[PDB]
Amino acid sequence: PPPLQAVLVADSFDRRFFPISKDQPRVLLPLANVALIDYTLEFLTATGVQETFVFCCWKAAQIKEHLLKSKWCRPTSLNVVRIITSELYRSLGDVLRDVDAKALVRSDFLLVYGDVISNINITRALEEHRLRRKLEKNVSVMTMIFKESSPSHPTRCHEDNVVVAVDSTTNRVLHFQKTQGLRRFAFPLSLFQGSSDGVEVRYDLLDCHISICSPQVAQLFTDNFDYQTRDDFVRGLLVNEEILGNQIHMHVTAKEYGARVSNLHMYSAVCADVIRRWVYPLTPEANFTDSTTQSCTHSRHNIYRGPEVSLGHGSILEENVLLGSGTVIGSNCFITNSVIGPGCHIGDNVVLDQTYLWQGVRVAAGAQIHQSLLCDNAEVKERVTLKPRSVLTSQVVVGPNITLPEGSVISLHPPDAEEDEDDGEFS
Amino acid sequence: QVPTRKDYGSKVSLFSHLPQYSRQNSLTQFMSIPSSVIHPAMVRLGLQYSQGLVSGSNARCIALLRALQQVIQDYTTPPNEELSRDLVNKLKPYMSFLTQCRPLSASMHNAIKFLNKEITSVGSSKREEEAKSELRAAIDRYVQEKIVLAAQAISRFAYQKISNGDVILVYGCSSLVSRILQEAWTEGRRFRVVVVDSRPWLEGRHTLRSLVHAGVPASYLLIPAASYVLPEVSKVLLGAHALLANGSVMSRVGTAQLALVARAHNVPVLVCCETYKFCERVQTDAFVSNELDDPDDLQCKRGEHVALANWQNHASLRLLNLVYDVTPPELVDLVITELGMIPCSSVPVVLRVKSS
Amino acid sequence: SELSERIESFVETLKRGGGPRSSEEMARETLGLLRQIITDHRWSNAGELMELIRREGRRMTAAQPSETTVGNMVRRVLKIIREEYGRLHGQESLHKLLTSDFSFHYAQLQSNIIEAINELLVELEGTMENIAAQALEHIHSNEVIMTIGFSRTVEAFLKEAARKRKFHVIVAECAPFCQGHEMAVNLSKAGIETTVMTDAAIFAVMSRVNKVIIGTKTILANGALRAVTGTHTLALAAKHHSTPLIVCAPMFKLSPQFPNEEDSFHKFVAPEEVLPFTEGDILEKVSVHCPVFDYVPPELITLFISNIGGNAPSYIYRLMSELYHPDDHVL
């Protein structure tokens, strides 16, 4: 009966996107010519959320400016977005402590980051959470959302891999731990003896980073000042079961998509999934963010073309190619599994494979670009070859007669960029 | 003796002459654990046929021949009897039990006929050990020259049709098609493969995984959407469970449809099959001779509800799980065999030259 | 602003997922929304009303191109407006060429438009009843029928025919969204002696089927069909065996568009239905396509059953002339 609320953390307090984050916030990065904040807001709106609180600390000005001129800030939107900013935020624990201090959440809110791509409907999960809290008389506290997956999937990164031990009878989480740099996983014997009705160890779960929480979550966060992340809260609750039990449960989805981008590998995986309609209805040609510049037409083999593209003669678009509005392509090109932003210019005989070209990128003729990323307004001169995993950030120009190594992140900032330059790689 | 397997559920009135079983019901619950009437190897083979642990026609034939070699090895001639007849008389109940576990395939029928002819030709004046060794060697030679060399020759023949930059549509899972595509990719051909699948077996995922591991670019879709992809398809390559004496191709349930739809889009149709699967029988439809699989396999979960959960309660409701269809010879362009590239109407001719 | 929020909710429902499951509910909702637009919005002349209706119709059609009933209702309302304006004020043919105007005001036009919309809704209410009533002329005793997917019109057809006849029905599940199971269960609950099969068996058993009765999502200008995926194979098999193909489709599923138009014809959904997400790494290298609609050429269809009776596909063009003005095709 109470309106469904949601807390949206628009600041990833870690630094995994440097030096790209030095100029633009990660939340505003264009995945498929659309910012991640737009994807998260669309996910929240579609699932029935009516009030959303946006907490942003780092580069809050750009986030606010982007949000105010967006679809969800219009008076006709059913999701009332409320931007709250502060410069003293350092962790998600601080955000929830401020939430408890301001008493923003009434009951049963949603905890999710600002870079989550999903189409999950939480109606069944919310109903199960409310039923558990009603029958058990305020024992269940949090319900995490996991997606059934395979350990070998590209979306399952090593850094965010996790293994759990739960009760298959009531879907109650009893143990939870990451598997980064581990060959063997240890489970305390206490969970077996505490509940001998059947415990199941699950490793086929992908963390969507979506939680159905309770105001008790905020109360526990403000009672434990040492909590900084959700994993810390989960581990501290699970270990301290003897007093103030406060069970936490889980929900598993199989026919719906959910993921969180946290690094370039996740960015590439989620972009590839979005292009191939794995996040339907959130599709590039669906124009879920009603902006005129993102209008696209869908063709065979997932070829999305924007207005006034004017593809050249002899060029071939093989599959999974998204072209922004105003992008100009030369002759005898070859684009495959790539996303091209609006306003880009491509020369003749250029080969692009699994690349991502943000808006304003200019590429000269004869370039060979594979598995790289080119931030907005970047430039590449003639006869330049980029090896996989290359990165050009914020208007870097690379001169002719150079082949970059595999891991080559370059920018205008000297320290963070591995080889800062604006005219090539030779000093 | 071995009892008769109980029919499960209610059959379609048009398929009431065919047996329909259930995977849960096993025939070994009424047989002694140290099996005496049926050889233990045959018991294991029938158990893994009925449970579906061996699916492909080639795999079924190889498993049958291996278990049959074991049976021949364990066989001892009774006193005051001749091996050339006692062996066949002893083998017949094993074949009946295997048929009860799951209806035999064309390859298994041909292998059984070949071994019956081999045993019948065994001399009455030769030693038992020599006869057993000769039977084992004959089974090994049959396996080799009828599967391995045949597949190699068919791959070599099919390499000619496959060209650079074309699109090939395959259906279901068959070892011959996968080997042909993998070998063609290895020799330097560059092409795409479109994999068509169908419920409930969903065995096209096997060939999808094989093609992905081999490095071939692949696409995957279900059979109802086939008419969507045939505009860009250049060839339709199919595998056959049997070739009939009238040219008709007996295969998986969806295969015929593809041929028909291919004919609607002007796409050539190739069928690859080994000559030992050629059958001298003829049939014009999938009704006179077929196999009804477990109807409960048709149940699928769409959301939180299974529509066909308790389908037994509805008296007028029937479920059929066909496993074969028959393709008319006018919908097939090529037959690729170890003999070569033949028209669909030359099946009897081969049957004539392999019997003399 | 109630009308504006209703329009926004309708557009969002069209974009995300179908609220009104039945096409008749969608048509009724579109007609009610158009009536509210006509009443609440202030317009003096007929031309401004037409351009406003065109604007909201363009928005609604852009929300979901596959859902053509909204555009059909918009064009029907536009033709109603044109007819009423012509009646209160004072068809490309050779006769018109040999033989041989908006921005005028009429006070009583609005009432005529409203009553025309109301009678259109009244006609809309009883379409399925008419189709069921005429069902009995096409089913004979001990017949064999084949159906694909789940359609309410065809199930009403069969249940009305089953009160006086005994016949066998074979339903092919429409994978991945196997909705044929639901129709088979519904028909079995009425004692119609049904059977359930997969798509792959269609051509296997069409040789023993007397006729095929199917529904559709949209009827095009030349008599072609936009149906569920697998209907083209069904029609091809029926043509191969020369079994008649009957299409039970009401008149609001009749769209004046033509097949070759921007190729935004099929609707593509998440490949999770075809290939699950648990497959693993192969999903990186595999292109999975899951169309939900299929194009059926008009030469594979034998008859069209609608609330106005039975017709041939060759006559469909005429039903276009009596329903939509030639200047409303582009919208």
Added chain:
Amino acid sequence: MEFQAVVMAVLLPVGNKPLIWYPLNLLERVGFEEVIVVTTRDVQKALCAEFKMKMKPDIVCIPDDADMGTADSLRYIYPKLKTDVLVLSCDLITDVALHEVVDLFRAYDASLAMLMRKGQRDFIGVDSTGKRLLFMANEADLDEELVIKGSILQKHPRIRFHTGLVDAHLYCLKKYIVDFLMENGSITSIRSELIPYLVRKQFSKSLDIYSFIKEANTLNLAPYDACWNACRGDRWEDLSR
């Protein structure tokens, strides 16, 4: 022969009928014309004479040494074993259809098929289908934590754990398991250090271990309470049997 039945006595003739009789009857019902029995010698090497007063088609009896484990008994009786073995024990009062365990052995070409029942200390973990068991350990070996290899969860990402299950000590064992036992005298007890070794040897042409879970009856354990419960249950159990 497909199987060779072996009965362990290292034993009790107590009850309404001798405790060894019930496994003998269970073997007799499903074929098993002959059965090899290892007779106790620590208490009295004369129980063969007592068993000679019973009523069975065919039994072979072999006296044992003073103290020996199940693996030691198999090491003693090696020459008389020719094919896959079916090892049982005197304490086994069950009504289970034996075709389930042997069917699991036959279908998957398993190296070991074992039977356990829901209880009414030792942790076992089976896969999703509930037939193949992936993990097995005892609290004595585990200090405070249960450790799973990464490869096991890579291949099988869903392991379901039981703790209170009761082992019925009925094993279908492949012949090369016996041969490996013969080449290595370290193993003394089948339950204690033979089965866990095979379980861990799966993940290191590969070992297959399968289990069948029952919900009707267990064996009469050494405790007197177990004997009383078995005596109470056998009154209804012996009606059909």
Added chain:
Amino acid sequence: PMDDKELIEYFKSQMKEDPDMASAVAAIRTLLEFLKRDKGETIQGLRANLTSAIETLCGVDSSVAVSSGGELFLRFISLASLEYSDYSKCKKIMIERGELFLRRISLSRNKIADLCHTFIKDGATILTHAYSRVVLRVLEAAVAAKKRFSVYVTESQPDLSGKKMAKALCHLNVPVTVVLDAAVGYIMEKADLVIVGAEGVVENGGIINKIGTNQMAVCAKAQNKPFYVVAESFKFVRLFPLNQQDVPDKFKYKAEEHPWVDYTAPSLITLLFTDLGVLTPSAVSDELIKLYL
């Protein structure tokens, strides 16, 4: 050994001296003459020289019948060498068998005419595509049987062979009408049956013929008219074209886009008239299957 030049002028003179003899027969005769004076010693060397000569002849003439005759000659050499291991006995056997084979393929045309002329009725209308000597011979046989019939012949636009066919028919006092290549669909309703030649019979039973044959066969099938093909046995070749594009390029060209050859599927053919008799298309494959073990 015979030089490449000597081979080419031998082929050209063999064609020139007898204008009525087909290219395949002349190619086979040239190959037999090459084998007659070879001065070799091993059957291994003989086959290499023979296939090189066949390649040269196919370079001179790109007709399918030449390649078919070359393949038939190679199979003949293999079959003869199978029986005899000694090279001299095999050489004599090949020479005598080649002489007999030459006389048989010379009688082939008359055999086809005698077998075929009975299908032509009295007052019937014949539709022919281009200039073929076999159809001319069967029409001669029909005329000799005192049968009266009319013939329509297309013009064969690239080289007006239909006009030559019409002149030859007029020499025989037969009412013959020349019609455009684009009017076959207009004329098919007046004809009673279609008799056409073939430059090569493919494995499945289809034919390889002049560029206008496929559309004539399709039009005949559309109106349910019988479609008869007369061809000699040395025109059997183990090729299987999936479609028109699958035909080898060495037969289409050098004989904007102007292919000289098309392929007709066996489903559009009623009967084949060879010196082996009157056959269904499905028979042809059998023969080939019998030839190569």
